């Protein structure tokens, strides 16, 4: 009724998870305590991302290679068999999650189930010759 509701206001929803006693970021509360790294710990942090360097000086160094065509697009047997049907050449790949704004791919026989659908691709490996030959179709 017109009485101070036993409780019906705002402190309700849900504690993120476990009893959040106070806001995060708390470690060594106000005042003095540890929470740090004794010794030369102060004016500046320790690491930097390099070294003296004894290791970074001149190990078995390499270099910055030139940009590649950016092939390597997983096109596995199955997931292309137990799905859709025939006609799976360059035009119907967007349907599947096989569509890089770049080019090329490869077939990786994750499964063996017969299909026997055909697939162009523009690439090929062992197993790409196997199958789609014993099943039918033509690779390019």
């Amino acid at each position: 009724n017109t009485l101070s509701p036993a409780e019906g206001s705002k402190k309700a929803g849900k504690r993120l998870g476990r009893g959040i006693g106070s806001g995060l970021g708390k470690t060594g509360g106000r005042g003095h305590k540890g929470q740090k790294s004794r010794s030369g710990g102060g004016v500046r942090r320790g690491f930097e991302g390099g070294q003296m360097p004894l290791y970074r000086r001149l190990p078995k160094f390499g270099f910055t290679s030139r940009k590649a065509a950016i092939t390597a697009e997983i096109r596995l047997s199955d997931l292309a068999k137990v799905e859709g049907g025939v006609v799976d050449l360059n035009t119907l790949k967007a349907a599947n999650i096989i569509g890089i704004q770049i080019e090329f791919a490869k077939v990786i026989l994750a499964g063996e189930v017969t299909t026997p659908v055909t697939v162009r691709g523009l690439r090929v490996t062992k197993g790409a010759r196997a199958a789609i030959e014993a099943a039918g179709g033509k690779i390019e």
């Binding site: 309700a12 929803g13 504690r15 993120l16 959040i20 806001g23």
Partner: protein, 198 residues
């Protein structure tokens, strides 16, 4: 299982529905307190397109500060600007997540399928024009004390319920944890339950 719906006559049974998600009474208590807190002010900082004119503003010395409209911001020097310290995004609010906030939204939907909770009401509920009719359907329902809890529905905002105690009407589309549980508690309608599924 099967959630027994109720008719206007608060009949013992009607259709059935439910939500599947490990309900967490660890997912129904603060969140909206954070909503209650966070929803009320919070000086972010950089969030603003304020820019600098540089020198030559107006015939007078005007430091090229992160200005905007006619007053400076962002810069820790002027108010409403970004705090110059470390660990807190807005004002006195609870830092945190998009997932738990939602996880609480999912988990809450599941809270409904709990014995000591709400109950599903047939669609006809949305028809009730007068408020008094609701009070009755709440009495026979044996959940009149739920007025201390809250209320909800589907289709459109229920004008007949809006009046009722601590009633903040909401629709199955846009419902926030706060609604699903105006304090880890609530009540909905048949269609609402279906809409919320998405």
């Amino acid at each position: 299982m099967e959630l027994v719906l109720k008719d206007a006559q608060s009949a013992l049974t009607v259709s059935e529905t439910t939500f599947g998600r490990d309900f967490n009474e660890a997912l129904v208590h603060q969140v909206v307190v954070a909503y209650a807190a966070g929803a009320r002010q919070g000086t972010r900082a950089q969030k603003t397109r304020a820019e600098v004119t540089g020198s030559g503003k107006k015939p007078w010395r005007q430091k090229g500060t992160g200005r905007a409209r006619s007053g400076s911001i962002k810069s820790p020097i002027w108010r409403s600007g970004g705090v110059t310290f470390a660990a807190r995004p807005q004002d006195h609010s609870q830092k945190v997540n998009k997932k738990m906030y939602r996880g609480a939204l999912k988990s809450i939907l599941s809270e409904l399928v709990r014995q000591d909770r709400l109950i599903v009401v047939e669609k006809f509920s949305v028809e009730a024009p007068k408020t008094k009719l609701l009070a009755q359907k709440l009495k026979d329902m044996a959940l009149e004390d739920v007025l201390i809890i809250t209320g909800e529905l589907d289709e459109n905002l229920f004008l007949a319920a809006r009046n009722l105690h601590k009633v903040d009407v909401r629709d199955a589309t846009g419902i926030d944890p706060v609604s699903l549980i105006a304090f880890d508690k609530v009540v909905m309608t048949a269609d609402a339950v279906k809409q919320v599924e998405e």
